[PDB]
Structure formats: structure tokens, C-alpha cells
Point group: C4
């Protein structure tokens, strides 16, 4: 095997087709399904799999009480077969911790998990299923990373980390790994003022990451990385189609180089594909909560501070719960272009459904089509009443 | 690996032997077995597996209530090892949707799943476990396909789809796929007046499909496809041994080029092997409901409008529930001829057993023998009372 | 791979060591373990596995009621990893039916399952996981076979079948298979008067089978097969150490060429290793029921009508339930000799423990040592009270 | 594959990072997790796995009552994927018995299990998943071995066994195996007065084992083995940082050549890495019970009778239960040095938590880092009240 190179451009996105769906909460009402959150999808050269952070309990288990909490000693990054649920019996643990990323470089997979108390966390970087490198907290305040896949080019796999405040300036670093070893790291540069939970994809030897400005911005920060020079830039999506949550209503003109205000100290992980007129943004439908999910075609969103939608697709109705969302692609597929894909975490339980004592999720995932396909909506599908 | 070619004729069918049986409803009374319907069997060069459409819940799970319904966002095509049950832990998802087909071409497998609302459905064609092509609804009325395996010849895998009314003329198309890409499609031609749910097999570079005329016919339509020319014909089975369900009693003379009347707007998926004097038809025993199942040797059924049985074999007694049935063969077996096989879906629960709130099935499957073997009957075997 | 040849003699048996044990009934009190009976062990070149006839239900499932019965449409030959229990999720179905044998020839595995009603049963012979040959009942009275592994030599795998009465003369046939095809069959010859359930092993190009004379004999019939000439002989074990069950007390002098009387129309599957002074016989301890199990070293048991034990080993105390027992060896092990092995079926439930409504078993298995090892006893270990 | 040689030295240990954690008791509150004890970790060239002695029941099963007991016919050495729990469906049985060790030699794995009554136990040595050698009890008093991995060098895998009293002199033997065959054995020599449960690692063609002196010592005996000469030495860790449990308080000066007194007839399995200034000792925090766990950097502990800690890391708080601990390394990792690893058994249930009737454990495991990483504590995490 050779290292994968990002040689292709994105396919033209004219609609989105169903790729995967695990129905995990429905199925786990009466089977041994682990409680999860922060899911994602990532491909190897011969298989694509679902990933998430386990909570170290089943959803029917008594230890599901308290799983609203984000960080414990009982979390782990797990992966499992595409569209199956994350079960006790089919989930493979990648590493232990409560914040993660993972990617395949064409030869083997790198997985990173962060664990520890808030003031003393550490990342362990695994390569070929073995621990290789460790990184201690630099700011002593919840070292944390993408919660979706990284992207590699000729063996170099950049990863975005943040350590520091969620409600003011923090210390974001871009690490450049190869075979699980640190080649270089850089502090964040550019005009993004706060970065968390980057969702990345690669095309034509460039990696684009759409992130969460938790502190101030309802527009999303974007980091663009050259994995050969090992350098990057940052800005915000210019468009007035605002894509964080909660957020204010959409204005007429956005902000390219600073956070669009109205909502402070909160957000959600999300994504975009930024490719000129072939630009699609994901967002929750609700401006107030993680409710609904839609894709909007917003030509030149990155650069055009007045850009509005020209097409769209509903993914989850606004009468259903959504959650985090992120990007991935099958960099080992056949053909001339990389097909954009994404997932949406469908959060069930706390805090919005507080008649149960747990929080979990299922996954839905879609990829682009060059056809203009009909749309369905894809809810989680479980009935909370059954769990009482 | 090279593409498989249909070089062999059918073996002489002198009786049927047990091939597989999963006992899924019995076992799922106390284990984590998914609710299914629309099962089938399909072989790869190194393994044969059971396939079906999951309902995204276990049979003991509370989400089994409502599973009489055919189309939801919680269905998927799954496969699992021959004669095991479809469990949460052993079922591999092929694709997401509520109508399917799948076949191996000798190199890898193509799987197709249709999803969407009734007026906006779409097919996704997967090849080598990746999405390759998408097809939007052409008639905006439940785009739908075979619900059993397709057949390939030198890489060309024809598939029959219908979109449109179930109770009047519809728009049937034969697509010719290779490596998941569309080579060609044609509209239905010939004298079949309505087509659904084709059950296909191949021999000597020809593919024969026995289908369901839901609208008018109690005889079954037959499509015969040349996968080299990429052309086809259609007619009905001429015999007065009528094989849809519900149906009128058997007459003395059938119809070759139009639907045999008496029953409108209903049917069941079924199959035949049409090979001159080596012709065998499957049918339910009951003329009123999906009850019992038998094979009848009906020499020249396709062409002889007075042909009656010369031999038979009971598969399921008329005091047991049956369901869909379909054809498959192991095109990678040893020997000089292809051995005909079939399966029967053994439907349990609603609507016939309405003391439970679910609908599911098990599978029995048989293949031909050149011996004249003794016969048993093969019921599902579960007791509904245990589920109350 | 080449076909395995029986080139080695037996290792010297000076005691027996623990090989495998599945604890299936203990574990299945609270996990999804299939109800079984008629287990055995058989090796492939790279793995050894447990085999048995499933009853198509879990032991906690409501469908376990009635599993005392031997023949239903819900039985199948399953295999699973050595010392694991037969679970819904790890059991591989080999074929469907209610009497079986299986063996590897060095290239691939042959498995045979018989199904049908008592007057119309048929065997299907699978090779390389595909059906190849079928055999109809010849006497219309419960066609039946070994219930433990067959043995192959240069691709020729003999199998012993019986069809006919269990309580008078029957029609026993030795079939010689190669690649699942019938080379030849012969009727039983020699002085054995009734044959069932042969337990076989091979050494130095000869196959020895120790069987059950259900009709009259409390000594066991022995068939010795030359798999090159495809011929056989039969007699009884001469020794007065009687090894069927139920049986009369041991006499002073046995019978070499006729059944030792005292018990009619019953028996149990059992085994021996018949190798001159290196001869070991298995038996239940009780003369009345399937209770206890012991190995006895009985020099020249086959030929010496006064031979008595010179050494022994208790396997199951007479205060614990036993069951069928049979022979197998790992013909692909390293070294200069074949190590004798056996298993004992530990039957729990009906008819001896009738406070439960099921019948099932676990497995213990041992192989020979050239050391004189200390002995333990190996009960099933489950508590029936837990199942009430 | 070639046999692995111990060519590397230990990496510099500046802290410990999380490697694996199975959360088995939390998860097994509502899934089919086997009851275990005496766990460990061991690597093959392509995978690392968790190992333990099953009790042949699930933790929710009724047969979990009585699992405080150490030796039964229902125990087996099982292995399962790293950080998954030991489930009925994913656990591979290595061999049957109630004391074990296992190691890979670079070509394949040797596993040893001891079974029998206390006065008549025997070891079976498996190689390449087949039984090869057997060893009878030499002292007729609970033949027993390491309960963690062995270590091999050029195919020679030494193993430490003890037979005899737990409360006076016993008969310890070092066996040197190759391909499961005995090359040599030696009686214990040196100044260790009692040996049990050795925890071993290899570096630079030497194997170091840290053991348990059950009879008298609260310092730990150390055996150092030359696997080429097949010879060994023994002494005690000289340091006054005492590492058995229970134990007296730490003195100022330890004992190098005799047991440090204060506690008789008890102990716990533990470990150390003894490498000059790169020396780290594990111990329980409590001096009275298996409570808490810490690593202490104790330069020259082996040789310096006044050596005190210079650094440490808490692994399990003293308000959480611990248990056995042992060493392992991935001898097939990339890089220039072997990274020290260890596990801690987190015992739950009896005797310390006697509101339940079972005893089981989970696993946490860590490996060394050359960074100075922040520390977390890693409890089992289950709530006993949930099991009542
Ligand atoms: C079967 O399946 C089919 C496939 O899925 C399905 O078809 C699909 O239907 C859906 C639903 O209708 C379509 O999705 C929608 O797409 C809209 C875009 O398309 C419309 O607009 C474009 C653009 O039009 C402007 O520009 C062009 C040129 O650039 C001009 O030609 C126009 O005249 C117009 O110009 C004006 O506007 C510009 C600025 O925007 C100015 O520059 C200009 O000067 C003028 O002012 C048209 O080109 C489209 O026409 C074409 O397509 C239609 C078919 O859809 C044909 O009939 C037609 O002939 C053409 O071919 C079309 O008119 C999206 O706008 C829309 O998304 C908004 O609405 C949804 C709710 O429905 C919101 O959830 C979403 O967030 C978007 O609205 C919010 O955000 C905007 C942006 O800020 C706000 O303005 C708005 O108020 C709203 O904000 C509020 O909500 C937010 C969210 O909660 C909140 O955050 C805010 O704060 C605020 O509260 C939606 O995506 C989809 O594209 C169809 N797909 C296809 C392929 O057809 C079909 O229906 C199915 N069949 C059945 C039977 O079910
Ligand atoms: C152990 O296992 C064994 C192996 O399984 C098992 O043996 C098997 O037994 C079963 C059961 O008996 C057999 O299965 C049946 O087979 C019948 C066919 O065989 C009979 O008929 C043929 C043909 O005979 C005609 O033709 C030949 C030449 O072509 C002539 O020689 C004849 O004289 C006769 O000619 C007349 O008819 C023609 C028109 O049909 C005219 O052309 C002609 O001019 C004359 O009028 C014979 O050859 C057979 O004989 C041979 O075999 C028997 C053994 O079976 C030997 O004894 C004998 O010596 C020969 O060797 C034989 O006589 C099928 O017809 C039958 O299926 C019908 O019945 C079942 C119910 O039992 C129905 O469910 C089924 O649907 C069929 O009936 C329906 O449909 C027909 C067609 O339209 C209707 O006419 C009929 O009324 C009925 O309709 C009703 O029900 C329908 C369904 O609900 C409904 O839809 C309708 O609307 C309506 O309500 C059945 O399959 C099997 O073949 C045996 N197998 C073998 C290998 O032997 C054995 O028993 C087991 N042992 C034990 C102990 O259990
Ligand atoms: C730790 O683990 C150790 C390893 O497991 C363990 O040691 C093992 O102990 C067990 C239990 O003791 C041993 O197993 C028993 O072995 C007996 C055989 O060994 C004895 O006999 C031989 C043979 O002796 C004759 O022959 C030699 C020469 O051939 C002569 O030298 C003798 O003098 C004698 O000659 C007479 O008999 C001949 C006819 O039989 C005539 O030819 C002759 O002219 C004379 O009349 C001896 O060689 C043995 O000695 C050697 O070994 C002992 C150690 O055991 C040493 O002390 C000694 O120094 C020697 O080295 C030894 O004496 C088996 O007979 C025995 O099995 C019977 O009993 C059990 C019950 O215990 C029954 O269940 C079983 O079925 C057998 O009895 C039934 O069947 C016989 C046969 O028909 C009947 O005769 C009998 O009445 C009985 O029938 C009844 O029950 C049946 C079953 O229910 C029923 O069907 C009938 O109808 C009827 O009701 C048993 O297997 C084992 O071998 C030891 N292993 C080793 C390696 O030592 C050790 O104890 C453990 N430690 C601890 C602390 O626990
Ligand atoms: C984020 O994560 C960080 C990384 O984990 C974390 O930092 C870590 O913090 C922990 C906790 O503080 C550290 O772990 C402790 O480490 C101690 C060792 O370090 C101290 O000591 C050394 C050595 O000092 C002597 O020697 C040097 C030279 O050799 C001299 O320079 C010194 O002056 C001194 O000399 C005296 O002593 C010698 C004899 O011992 C004589 O030779 C000499 O003549 C003098 O008398 C120092 O070098 C260290 O300083 C350096 O590090 C600190 C940071 O820790 C810096 O601030 C500093 O500037 C330096 O760089 C440091 O002072 C361990 O001793 C300690 O373990 C004991 O305590 C714990 C309880 O806390 C016990 O559980 C444990 O068992 C040990 O105590 C028991 O055992 C000893 C030995 O017998 C007994 O003496 C003692 O009484 C006690 O016994 C009792 O309990 C036993 C257990 O129950 C029982 O069995 C007994 O019977 C009895 O009842 C502990 O491991 C860790 O190393 C830090 N890691 C790092 C990298 O910094 C950080 O806090 C986290 N952040 C936050 C915000 O949470
Ligand atoms: C497991 C068990 O209880 N076995 C006992 C059996 C059975 O109770 C009956 O044989 C059942 O009918 O009875 C014995 O007398 C016997 O046969 O030797 C004693 C033996 O201990
Ligand atoms: Ca369960
Ligand atoms: Ca924000
Ligand atoms: Ca019809
Ligand atoms: Ca008998
Ligand atoms: Ca001690």
C-alpha cells in the first residue's frame, strides 16, 4: 500500500442520497447497544465504519443514568460496521478517552483519544493499532479535538486541537502527524477567533475544516491547510446563511473575518463543503436548539458576504432532534472525483427528553449525487415512551 | 476473478431437498432477532447468504409494533450467514431502503436499495460496497424492484423496476448495469400488462424472470432477457395451473398473452423454473391467502395453455403460513449444470395473526435433486401464544 | 492442500487430559444459548470445533418446551468455536436435519444431514459448504447416521448409515464418499447384528468404528473399514467389560460374534480405542441410566473374551448425568502419532430432570496423554433449580 | 515468521498513559459478560488482547453465586479483543483450568492451563492452539502458575510454577519451553524463600519476573532468567518501598535477600520494572486490602536497601477497589525500545462488597510515556446497588 494523495476534486453535488443509518436507539430498546455521543464516519481502503464515543454502558443498563455528562473514565472511541448499531459485541475499541479523531493514511489508521481530568488531560496518538505519541495539556483546560475524521495527504495527517476556555480566547494548535509521530505543530493563525470540533475534508492537495466558534460566532470558522507546506489560514464563512446553533436569524450580509454576533458561549459541531458554486452548508433548522437538519446550496458561501441559497434538501424535519454533524469521504472509491459525504448525530434523551435519565444518539449519513434526487426526512425513529 | 458467464443449463429437477432454514421467529422469541420481511438468498463465489429488509427493531422490542407497514426510514437491506437468523449482531447492512435486489457478478456484488416517500423515491446502486449510481423516480409512485436476487452475465446485471400504479398500467423499466453503472435501460415490451417483484435465474446466456401482475393476472408474467444484446421479451405463463395469490380456481386452459382474470389489485411475489419438460412452478396451496406452498412439475407451462401437473412436492402445509417466494442458484458450484433453488418467506404476525402487533417472517429454502426424494413440510414453527 | 492420509499410529494412552468444555447449560441460564443434543468434535487443518444438533430455540426461550423430542423441522447441524457455548450469534449451520456426521478430508469438509418424516427421510451430502449428493431412505424407517465425525483417507470418507427397525434387523450401509460423491456403498457384513451411531477414528490406513447395537447387545459392535479397498468387517468387542447402557452387570467372559444379552431395545452412543495393549473403553458408570462416565484400560478388549481393566480414569462421577460419547482426533497435529480424543455429552433436563420442560446438554472433551496424570471429574455444573 | 528475540532495552518511563479499559462490570450489568478474575494482557505480532480466567457464567446469571471460589471445573482461560468486555459471544477459550499463563514466541502462541483437584492437578501446554505437553503435580498441593504473560526469546519461553504450601516452603520450578515442549526445568535457586504468581518482562536477552512471597515477605521476590543459558537467580526487591498487600508500613531500610516481615500467609500478584534509575514499582495504596493503586519511581529499587520514591502516579484512588496487577509489553511495536505496560484487576463483589453473591473484575491497563503526562484515576465504575 502507498499513502493516499488528495489528487481529485469534489464531485458536483446536485442532491444527497442515503448512505447509512443505524437506528441505534430503536434497536437498543431491546438489544445490547452501547450509549454513545459524538459519532462520525471514516473509511479505510477496503471498508467504511461508524465511530463514536461510548459511555461504557448499554442504553437499557442502569449505568445509562448520568450519560448527559461529556467526560468520564468510562468513555472510549469505538468503531463498528457501517449501519449496524454500536453493540457490546460488535464494537471495536480504538482508544480510551472522551474526545477523538481518526483517519486512514492509505497504509494504516491513526486514532487519537484524549483523557484526563479537566486540568490535566493528555492525547494518545495510536498508529497501526499501537500507541506511538503522547501530548500533554498545554493550557490545562479540557484539551479537545475534532470529534470527526482527520484527513491525510502523502502520509501527513493534520489534526486540530484546542485547549483553554470555551467562553474566551483559547490555545488552538494544528499538529501534523506522520506514522503517529509529530512532524510539526503550529498555533492557529488567521482571523478565526475561537475554534472547536473541526469537520474536515480534502481535495486537490488542500484540507478544508469547518469548525465551531463557541465563544462568539454564529457563522462558522474555516481553517484551510496545505499538508505539503504544513501551513494554514483561517477565516469565517462570509455568507449570511448562518450555520451554528443556537444562532440569531439570518441577516442580509455576513462577516468574513470576525464572528457574527448574537449568541455567546454555545454552539454545535457542524460542517460545509466549500467549492465555489458547488458549495453546500449544513445546519440545524431551529435557531434555538439541535432540532431539524438541512443542506443548503450557497454558491461562494466562503467568500461572498451576501450569498443566499439556490437549492436545498431537508435531512431531518424540525419536529425531530438532530445534533452534531461532520464531513467524511471515501478517498478510496472508484472514479474521477471525491463524493462529499456527511453524517448527522440524532440525539435522544437528555436534556431535551428528560423523562429518561440517559443521553444517546443514532446516526444518519448521506453522500452526494450528481442527480437531482427526491428527498425524504430521516429521524431517529425511537419512541421515548417505550423506555419509561 | 473473472465475470461469471451463464454457460450451463439447469440440472434435471426430480425433487427438492432442504437447503436452508433459519427458524428466526422461534429463536427470536428469546434472542435479539431483527424483524424482517421480503427475504431472499444470494450467492457469492465463496459463500451463500440470507438477505431481507429489516424493520430496524427486534421482534421482542417495543418498536416491533407497527411492522405490518412496508415502507419506513428504519428499513435496510441486510444479509447474514446461511440458516442463521437475522440478528442485531450478525446482520450486515448492504444499503438503506424499503425495496431491494442484489447479485454477485463473479468479481464483486451489486446491491440496490430504494428509499423515499411514495412520490419522491430513489434507487441507490452500490457496487463493491460503495455507492456508484442513483436513479430518481420516473412516475412518482413507489419506485420498486425485485425483492430477490438479480443475475449477471459477463458483468451485465439486468434489473427490473416498476414505478406507477399497483392497480393499473405502470412504467416498468429493465436496467442493464455493469460495475454499478447504467449501460442501457429499456421500457417493458411484450404482452405482460403489469410487472412487479420479478424472481430471476440464468442459464445458457439467458435470464428468465417470473413476476407478479398485481393489477389483473392470476397467471404470472414472464420476462426473458438476453444480457448480451440487452433486449427482452415478455408474456405470461400459458398453463392453467395458476400461481399468483389470491387467485380463482384452476381452469382447463390458461392465457399466454394476457392476464388470467378473476382477482384484481393484489398478488404475491413468486417464481418458476421454465425449461421444457423440466418445468416446475411454485404456488401457495390456498387460493385465498398466503397459506401453504407447493411445487408442481408442469411440463411446458410457459408455452402449453392446457399443461397440468405430472409430479409435485408439498413444501409448507396449507395449515401453515407462507409468503413471498423467489429463485436463486449457486452459479459458482461444481459440476456440469446449475441446480435450481428457491426460498419461501414464512410470514408470522399481522394481518393473519393479529394477537401480536408485529409482522415478521422466517425463511425456508430448497434446491433441486436428480433423485426422487421423500417430502417433508417445513413450517415456521413458532407459537404465537408465547409472544403474548 | 492435499488429501489427508492416515499414516500414523495412535499415541500411547497413559491417561486423559482436559481438552475442551463449554459449560453451555450454566452459561445459557442467562445468555442466548441454543438447545442442543447429539454433540461431537471435529477438526479442520487449522481449527477444531464443537458440533451438535440444534433444536432451533434457546434454552430460556419458550420454544424449549418439548425438546426431549429427537426429530423436528427445527433441527440443524451447527458448529461453533472449541469450548465456547453454541449461541445464536456464534453457531454456523452446516446443514438442516436431525441426524448428522461431518469430517474434513484435508482439502475441505463434508457434512451430512438427514431430514424428513420417519417413513420418507433423505440424506443431503454437502462438500465445501455446498450440496452435492442426496440419498433417499431405502427402508422407510428413520434413516440415520453416526452423530459424530467421519474419517477420511486419501479423499475417501466412509460413513455408516442405518435405516429400519431399532428393535430388530435393520439395513445398515457403509457409503464411501469422495468430494461429496458416492464412489461405492456396501451392506453391513460380518457378525454385528444391529448397528447405530458409529464412533470412528483412523490410524495406519484403517478406520475403526465402535457402534450401538440397540436391539440386543450390551457389548458394542465394531466395524473396521479399509478405505483403500473400500471393504469392511464387523464383530463385537469380546471383553466382558460391557460398555453400552443400560446393560447387565459385567460377566467373566464376553461375546466376540454376537450380542451379549440382558438388555433389549435401548442403548447409548459410545466409543473405544482398540489398539492391542493400548486399548481404552468408555462407558457410563451406571448400568441403568446415562449417569457417570469412565475410561477403562482393557488390554486386547477387541479380541480377548476374558479381558478386564488394568487402569482407569473417572471422567464424570456417577452422581452426575452423562449421555452420548464419541471419538475424534486432530489428524493435522504435529508429531509422530495421532492423539486419541473423545467427548461426553452431559445431558440436562428431560427425562431425568423433569422439573424443566426442555432437554439440552453441555460438552466435555479429553485427549490422551503419555503421562500418568491426576484425575478430576467434569460435571455439567448447572443447577436445575435456577431454571424454575 | 521468525522467533522474537529480546533485542531492545526499555523505553524511559516518565509517566504512564491509558492503554486499555474494558468497563466490564458496568457493561455486564445489562449484557452477557462472563464472570472473571486473574486477568492479564498479552500481544501477538498483529494484535494485543485481554485474557482472564472465566468462571463459566455471566455476572447477571444465577450461577454467579459462589464465584468468590478460585478453583472449579467451570473455569477456562479466555481471551478477547483489547478493551472490549469478556462476553459470551466474543471470548475465545485458550484452554480449560483455573491457573494460567500465555505468550507468543513470534511464530505462534503457547498457552498453559492447570486443572484438577488440589492434590491431583496437572498442567496442559498448548502450542499453535493444540495440546502438546502435560505436567503432573509434583507436590500434590495446588500446582499453579503466573496468572500473567510469559516471555519468549529465540523460541525459548520460561514459565514459573509452584506446587506446595502457600504458608511454608514450596516447590517452585522454572520450565523452559520451546514449541510447547520441555527443553529443561530447574528448581528455584537464590534467596527468594517463596514464589507465586510471577509477573515477567524481557529486555536485552534477560527476563525479569516480580513475584509474590505469600508465606512471609511484604517485599517482592524477583527472579531473573537467562533464556539462552536457561539459568536463573532470585532475590527480593531491596527497597523499603514495600509492594505486596497486606503489608506493614514502609520502613527506612528494606531486605535484599530475605522476606521483609510483618504479614504472613497472604499477598497479591504484582509487578515492577527494574532498570536502574528507570525503575518503577506498582502497589496498592492501602496496606490492609486491595484498595487503590499507584506507580512509584524508585531508582535502583532492586539493589538499594534505602531507595525511596522520586516521582509517582496514582492509577486507582484508595477509595476504589484494585486487585492483581502484572506486566506485559508489545514486543512487536515499532521503534528502538520496548514500552513498559501493566494492567490492574479491579475486583468487584465478594468479599469486600458482600451485598452481591458474586466476585468479578474489570481491567485497566497503561503503558509508559517519555512525556510527563497529567494523571487521572481509573476506577471500575460500576454501582453495586444496581445489581441488588
Ligand atoms: C421531491 O424532491 C425534490 C428534491 O428535494 C423537491 O424539490 C426541492 O424542494 C425544496 C423545497 O421547496 C427545495 O429547497 C428549497 O430551496 C430553496 C431555493 O430554491 C428557490 O430559490 C432559488 C433562488 O432564487 C433566487 O435566485 C435565483 C438566482 O440566484 C433567482 O432566479 C430567483 O428569482 C431568486 O432571486 C431572489 O433572491 C435572491 C437572494 O436569495 C436575490 O439575489 C434576487 O435578486 C431575488 O431577491 C430558485 O432558483 C429556485 O427556483 C428553482 O427551483 C424551484 C424548485 O424548488 C422551481 O420551482 C423553479 O422553477 C426553479 O427551477 C427556488 O425558488 C431554498 O431557499 C429553501 O430553503 C429556505 O427555506 C427553507 C424552508 O422551506 C428553510 O428551512 C431554509 O433555511 C431556507 O430559508 C431560510 O433561510 C433563507 C436564507 O437566509 C431565508 O431567506 C429564509 O427566510 C429562511 O430563513 C428563516 O429560516 C431559517 C431556518 O429555520 C432561520 O435560520 C432564519 O433565521 C429564518 O427564520 C429550500 O432549501 C429544493 O431546492 C428542491 N429541489 C429541487 C432539485 O427542485 C420536491 O419538492 C419534492 N416533491 C414533492 C412533491 O414533495
Ligand atoms: C414419500 O415422498 C414421496 C415424494 O414426495 C411421495 O410421493 C409424492 O406424492 C405426492 C402426493 O401424491 C405427489 O404429488 C402429487 O402429484 C400429482 C401428479 O401425479 C399424478 O398425476 C400424474 C399425471 O397423470 C395424468 O397424466 C399422465 C401422463 O401425463 C397419465 O398417465 C395419467 O393417467 C393422467 O392423465 C389424466 O390427466 C391429464 C391432465 O392432468 C390428461 O392429459 C389425461 O388425458 C388424463 O385426464 C401421474 O403420472 C402420477 O402417477 C405417477 O405417480 C404416482 C405417485 O404420485 C404413482 O402412484 C403412479 O404409478 C405414477 O408413477 C400421479 O397420478 C399432482 O397432480 C398433485 O398435485 C395436485 O394435488 C394436490 C393435492 O394433493 C394439490 O395441492 C395440487 O395443487 C394439485 O391439484 C390441484 O391442481 C390441479 C391442477 O390444476 C387440479 O387438477 C386439482 O383439482 C387441484 O386443484 C385444486 O387445488 C388447487 C390447490 O389448492 C387450487 O389452486 C385449485 O383451484 C383446485 O381447488 C401432487 O403434486 C408426488 O408427485 C409424489 N412424488 C413421487 C416421486 O412419487 C410419497 O407419497 C411419500 N410417501 C408417503 C408414504 O408419504
Ligand atoms: C490421583 O490421580 C490418579 C490418576 O487418575 C489416581 O490413580 C488412579 O486411581 C484409580 C482409582 O483407584 C485407578 O482406576 C481404577 O483402576 C483399576 C485397575 O487397577 C487395579 O487393577 C490392576 C489390575 O490388577 C489385576 O491384574 C494385574 C495384572 O494384569 C495383577 O497384577 C493384579 O493382581 C490383578 O489380578 C487379578 O485380576 C485379574 C482380572 O481383573 C486376574 O487376571 C488376576 O488373576 C487376578 O484376579 C492393578 O494392576 C492396579 O495396580 C496398580 O495400580 C495401583 C493404583 O491404582 C497401585 O496401587 C498398584 O501398586 C499398581 O501399580 C490396580 O490394583 C480398575 O479396576 C478400576 O475400575 C473398576 O472400579 C471402578 C470403581 O472404582 C469401577 O467404576 C470400574 O467400572 C471398574 O470396576 C468395575 O468393573 C470391573 C470389570 O468388570 C469389575 O470387576 C468390578 O467389580 C466393577 O464392576 C461393577 O461396576 C461396574 C461399573 O459401575 C458395573 O458395570 C459392573 O456390573 C459392576 O457392578 C479403576 O478404573 C487408576 O487406574 C489410577 N491411576 C493410576 C495411574 O494410578 C489417584 O488415586 C489419585 N490420587 C488421589 C489421592 O485421589
Ligand atoms: C497533573 O498531573 C501531574 C503528573 O501526574 C501531577 O504531578 C504529580 O503529582 C504527584 C503528587 O504530588 C507526584 O507524585 C508523588 O511523587 C512524590 C515524589 O516527588 C517528591 O519527592 C521527590 C524526591 O524528593 C527527595 O529527593 C530529592 C532527590 O532524590 C530531593 O531533592 C528532595 O529534597 C527529597 O530529599 C528527601 O527525601 C529523601 C528520601 O525520600 C532523602 O534522600 C533526602 O535526604 C531528603 O530527606 C522530589 O524530587 C519531588 O520534587 C519534584 O517534583 C515536584 C512535583 O511533584 C515539584 O514541585 C518539585 O519542584 C520537583 O520538581 C517531590 O517533592 C512521591 O513521594 C509521592 O508518593 C508518596 O506519597 C503518596 C501520597 O501522596 C503515597 O501514596 C505514596 O505511597 C508515597 O508516600 C508513601 O510512601 C513513602 C515511601 O516509603 C513514604 O515516605 C510516605 O510517608 C508514604 O507512606 C505512607 O503511605 C504508603 C502508601 O499508603 C504506606 O504504604 C506507608 O506505610 C505509609 O503509610 C507521589 O508519588 C508526581 O510525581 C507528580 N508528577 C510530576 C511529573 O510532577 C500534578 O500534581 C497534576 N496537577 C494537578 C493540578 O492536579
Ligand atoms: C446422576 C444420578 O443421580 N445417578 C444415580 C442413578 C440414577 O438416579 C438412576 O439410574 C436414574 O434412573 O441411580 C444409581 O442408582 C445408578 O444408576 O447407578 C446411582 C446414581 O448415582
Ligand atoms: Ca438479553
Ligand atoms: Ca457559536
Ligand atoms: Ca395478481
Ligand atoms: Ca444396546
Ligand atoms: Ca506476602
Amino acid at each position: 500500500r502507498d499513502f493516499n494523495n488528495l489528487t481529485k476534486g469534489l464531485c458536483t453535488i446536485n442532491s444527497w442520497h442515503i448512505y447509512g443509518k443505524d437506528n441505534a436507539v430503536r434497536i437498543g430498546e431491546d438489544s445490547d447497544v452501547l450509549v454513545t455521543r459524538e459519532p462520525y464516519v471514516s473509511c479505510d481502503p477496503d471498508e467504511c465504519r461508524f465511530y463514536a464515543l461510548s459511555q461504557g454502558t448499554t442504553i437499557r443498563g442502569k449505568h445509562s443514568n448520568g450519560t448527559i455528562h461529556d467526560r468520564s473514565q468510562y468513555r472510549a472511541l469505538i468503531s463498528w460496521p457501517l449501519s449496524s448499531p454500536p453493540t457490546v459485541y460488535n464494537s471495536r475499541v480504538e482508544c480510551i478517552g472522551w474526545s477523538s479523531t481518526s483517519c486512514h493514511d492509505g497504509k494504516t489508521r491513526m486514532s487519537i483519544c484524549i483523557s484526563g481530568p479537566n486540568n490535566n488531560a493528555s492525547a494518545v496518538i495510536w498508529y497501526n493499532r499501537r500507541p506511538v505519541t503522547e501530548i500533554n495539556t498545554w493550557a490545562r483546560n479540557i484539551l479537545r479535538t475534532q470529534e470527526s475524521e482527520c484527513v491525510c495527504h502523502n502520509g501527513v495527517c493534520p489534526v486540530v486541537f484546542t485547549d483553554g476556555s470555551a467562553t474566551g480566547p483559547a490555545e488552538t494548535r494544528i499538529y501534523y502527524f506522520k506514522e503517529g509521530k509529530i512532524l510539526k505543530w503550529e498555533p492557529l493563525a488567521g482571523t478565526a477567533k475561537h475554534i472547536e470540533e473541526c469537520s474536515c475534508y480534502g481535495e486537490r492537495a488542500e484540507i478544508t475544516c469547518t469548525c465551531r466558534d463557541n465563544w462568539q460566532g454564529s457563522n462558522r470558522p474555516v481553517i484551510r491547510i496545505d499538508p505539503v507546506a504544513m501551513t494554514h489560514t483561517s477565516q469565517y464563512i462570509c455568507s449570511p446563511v448562518l450555520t451554528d446553533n443556537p444562532r440569531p436569524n439570518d441577516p442580509t450580509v455576513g462577516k468574513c473575518n470576525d464572528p457574527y454576533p448574537g449568541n455567546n458561549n454555545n454552539g454545535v459541531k457542524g460542517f460545509s463543503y466549500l467549492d465555489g458554486v458547488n458549495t453546500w452548508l449544513g445546519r440545524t433548522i431551529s435557531i434555538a436548539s439541535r432540532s431539524g437538519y438541512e443542506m443548503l446550496k450557497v454558491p461562494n458561501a466562503l467568500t461572498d458576504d451576501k450569498s443566499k441559497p439556490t437549492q436545498g434538501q431537508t435531512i431531518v424535519l424540525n419536529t425531530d432532534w438532530s445534533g452534531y454533524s461532520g464531513s467524511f469521504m471515501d478517498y478510496w472509491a472508484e472514479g474521477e472525483c471525491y463524493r462529499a459525504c456527511f453524517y448527522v448525530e440524532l440525539i435522544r434523551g437528555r436534556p431535551k427528553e428528560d423523562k429518561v435519565w440517559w443521553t444517546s444518539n443514532s446516526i444518519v449519513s448521506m453522500c452526494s449525487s450528481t442527480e437531482f434526487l427526491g428527498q425524504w426526512d430521516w429521524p431517529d425513529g425511537a419512541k421515548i415512551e417505550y423506555f419509561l
